[PDB]
Amino acid sequence: IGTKTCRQVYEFRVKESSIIAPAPAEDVDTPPRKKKRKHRLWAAHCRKIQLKKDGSSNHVYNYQPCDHPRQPCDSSCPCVIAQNFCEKFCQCSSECQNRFPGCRCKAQCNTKQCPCYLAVRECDPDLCLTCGAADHWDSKNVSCKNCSIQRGSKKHLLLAPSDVAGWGIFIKDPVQKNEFISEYCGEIISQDEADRRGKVYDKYMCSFLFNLNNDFVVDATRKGNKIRFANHSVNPNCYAKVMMVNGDHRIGIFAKRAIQTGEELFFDYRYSQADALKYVGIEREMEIP
Amino acid sequence: TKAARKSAPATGGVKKPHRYRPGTVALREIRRYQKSTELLIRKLPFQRLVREIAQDFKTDLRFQSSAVMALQEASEAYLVALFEDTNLCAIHAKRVTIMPKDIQLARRIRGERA
Amino acid sequence: RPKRTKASMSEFLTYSSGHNRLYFHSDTCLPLRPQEMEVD
Amino acid sequence: NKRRKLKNKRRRSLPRPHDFFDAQTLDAIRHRAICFNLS
Ligand SMILES: Nc1ncnc2c1ncn2[C@@H]1O[C@H](CSCC[C@H](N)C(=O)O)[C@@H](O)[C@H]1O
């Protein structure tokens, strides 16, 4: 502030210090300095959680910021109850034994060996340090193949009336397998409203609903992006896998196999066979012999 | 009354702990010791071990602090050589682990057994 | 290769590439001309 | 594909791809052919 010089402001703070109680100005170092924190214990800690309730592998709880103002990261931690890891936003301390360690793989966070690709975690911009996550975030190209959703770097999809049924989604260029395609973005909505609205769509046969997790659903009728018009196939060239990034579950889409220019996109809805003929009974491919 | 929700398969993998195959730590152990010159038996246990064996040969023995080191080199020097030759008997058995029936063999060949 | 099989009564009871069909404007369901396959 | 069969390997059923011909020109051709047949 240029209105006042430091003198009579320093003196004002002298008056302020005499009026307002002095600030604490306390510094801490924590009893731990280094070591005693091997990431195998984290995996062991993860193993403990995995065998407790993650063995079911069906109850996907969305992340919630847990508050631990004084209590440590005990078994009462909401993420522990929600069979989930704490995040950087969690009120758990910087020593919280649940947070993801990182994505330190040297080549790029994209393959089976890397903890990011095996786990739900899309590699954090601040964690997958070797795969250039934080580096040149403006630059579209990067070593990693598990941060495109972080960057939002989609493909250039095309809209044209699908030969199978109505509208579909085409691609202008070849694309390889096991790599990022445009994300099925949409609207966050709970199960109860999803069935009520779905009941309307079920009456109208529309199914722009997607089972995000057991706790929330994403619907694409009113609001969405282009890929919502992708048609279903039982053996499609492209698949769908929920990913988990930056504290928000999303659903990434990736091609199963190598693709060339102009191929129409399909992915499995993962509905019941009765519902399959009820909704997607068209496949358009016989047996050759 | 549940609407048909388009789902995707969920996964929950985590970092698998890494265990060295047995015996592969050993080769890592051997070379760091064959490149190491320090004593392999804790320094003090002898000063309370020998002051006991010697106690039976005569009473009230006040050792000299350097001499206790002198034994402490020989016991290591005597044992290390014995194990080295022990392996030779073990490998000669086509096995790879030493057994107490090989120390007793390798101690009769040298002639210490009698 | 043409099969050129022998004529017979018992004989009775598409290697496409590139683009084939026109694509529409995703924003507004409008016909998209080929001149803008890239800014689209 | 060495085992590739004939051209009919597309589908078992599909929606109609819409016809290129028109009904009104058929009537004009018919009457054009009618007078053509009269001569
Ligand atoms: N392979 C398929 N065969 C028949 N119906 C399908 C299908 N894939 C998706 N659908 C249906 O299409 C609906 C999505 S709306 C898209 C329909 C069509 N592509 C059009 O644009 O007109 C869903 O409710 C689903 O029931």
DSSP code at position A240: E
The three-state secondary structure class of A43 is helix
The three-state secondary structure class of A241 is strand
The three-state secondary structure class of A242 is strand
Q: Are A289 and B22 in contact (CB under 8 A)?
A: no
- Residue A101 CB-density burial (10 A; 0-12 exposed, 13-18 middle, 19+ buried): middle
A217 CB-near residues (< 8 Å, 6+ apart): A188, A189, A190, A191, A194, A209, A210, A211, B5
Helices (H), chain A: 10-19, 39-49, 78-81, 115-118, 148-151, 191-203, 273-279
Q: Which of A226, A217, A207, A215 is nearest to A187 (CA)?
A: A217
Question: Is A43's CB within 8 Å of B4's CB?
Answer: no
Interface mutation vs chain A, best among C14, C15, C16, C21, most A CBs within 10 Å: C21
Task: Confirm whether B60 is domain-assigned.
Answer: yes
Give me the DSSP letters along chain B: -----B--------PPP--PPTTHHHHHHHHHHHT--S-SS-HHHHHHHHHHHHHHHSSS----HHHHHHHHHHHHHHHHHHHHHHHHHHHHTT-SS--HHHHHHHHHHHT---
Distances (CA, A) of C4 to A166, B105, C1: 39, 87, 9
A268 CB-near residues (< 8 Å, 6+ apart): A232, A233, A234, A236, A239, A240
Rounded Cα distance, B90 and B106, in Å: 10
**Residue A100 corresponds to which tokens in the numbers above?**
């993801």
Q: Are A210 and A242 in contact (CB under 8 A)?
A: no
Rounded Cα distance, B82 and B43, in Å: 21
**Residue B22 corresponds to which tokens in the numbers above?**
């047995």
Q: Which amino acid is at B89?
A: C
Question: Is C37's CB within 8 Å of A172's CB?
Answer: yes
Task: Confirm whether B10 is domain-assigned.
Answer: no
Q: Are A281 and A234 in contact (CB under 8 A)?
A: no
CA A245 centroid distance within chain: 3
Task: Confirm whether B11 is domain-assigned.
Answer: no
Residues touching ligand 1 (Cβ under 6 Å) are: A 162, 164-168, 205-207, 229, 231-232, 279-282
Spell out the long-range contacts of B63-68 with Cβ–Cβ below 8 A and sequence spacing 24 or more.
none
Interface mutation vs chain C, best among A156, A157, A159, A261, most C CBs within 10 Å: A159
* Bridge partner residues of A266 (DSSP): A231
Closest ligand 1 atom number to CA of residue A284: 1
Q: What angle do CA A149, A181, A210 make, to 5 degrees?
A: 80
Experimental technique used to determine this entry: cryo-EM
Task: Confirm whether B9 is domain-assigned.
Answer: no
Rounded Cα distance, A110 and A120, in Å: 12
Task: Confirm whether B6 is domain-assigned.
Answer: no
Task: Confirm whether B5 is domain-assigned.
Answer: no
Q: How far is the CA of A253 from the centre of ligand 1 (A)?
A: 18
A32 CB-near residues (< 8 Å, 6+ apart): A95
Number of domains in chain B: 1
The three-state secondary structure class of A277 is helix
Candidate of A222, A229, A238, A280 to mutate for ligand 1, largest count of ligand atoms within 8 Å of Cβ:
A280
Strand-pair category, A167-171 with A238-245: unpaired
Distances (CA, A) of A245 to A134, A219, B10, B46, C16: 15, 19, 14, 60, 39
Resolution as reported, in Å: 4.1
Distances (CA, A) of A179 to A131, A174, A270, D8, D24: 15, 12, 20, 33, 52
Query: Beta-carbon neighbour count of residue A176 at 10 Å?
Result: 10
Q: Are A262 and A170 in contact (CB under 8 A)?
A: yes
What is the residue range of B60's domain? Answer: 18-114
Rounded Cα distance, A241 and B7, in Å: 9
Task: Confirm whether B102 is domain-assigned.
Answer: yes
Rounded Cα distance, D29 and D39, in Å: 15
Q: What angle do CA D24, D26, D32 make, to 5 degrees?
A: 110
DSSP code at position A226: G
- Residue A139 CB-density burial (10 A; 0-12 exposed, 13-18 middle, 19+ buried): exposed
Rounded Cα distance, A229 and A266, in Å: 9
For A237-254, letters b (16+ CB in 10 Å) and e give bbbbebbbbbeebbbbbb
Q: Angle, nearest 10°, between helix axes B65-92 and B100-110?
A: 100
Task: Confirm whether B57 is domain-assigned.
Answer: yes
The three-state secondary structure class of A199 is helix
DSSP code at position A205: T
| Cross-chain CB nearest to B8 (options A43, A207, A240) | A240
Q: Angle, nearest 10°, between helix axes B43-57 and B65-92?
A: 100
Strand-pair category, C30-31 with A157-161: unpaired
Q: How far is the CA of A168 from the centre of ligand 1 (A)?
A: 9
Rounded Cα distance, A269 and B9, in Å: 10
Q: Which of A65, A125, A127, A69 is nearest to A93 (CA)?
A: A69
D-chain CB neighbours of A288 within 8 Å are 3-5, 9
Query: Beta-carbon neighbour count of residue D28 at 10 Å?
Result: 10
Q: What is the CATH number of the domain that holds B80?
A: 1.10.20.10
Give me the DSSP letters along chain C: ----PPP-GGG------S--S--EETTTTEEPPGGGSS--
Rounded Cα distance, B44 and B68, in Å: 9
Strand-pair category, A180-181 with A248-255: antiparallel
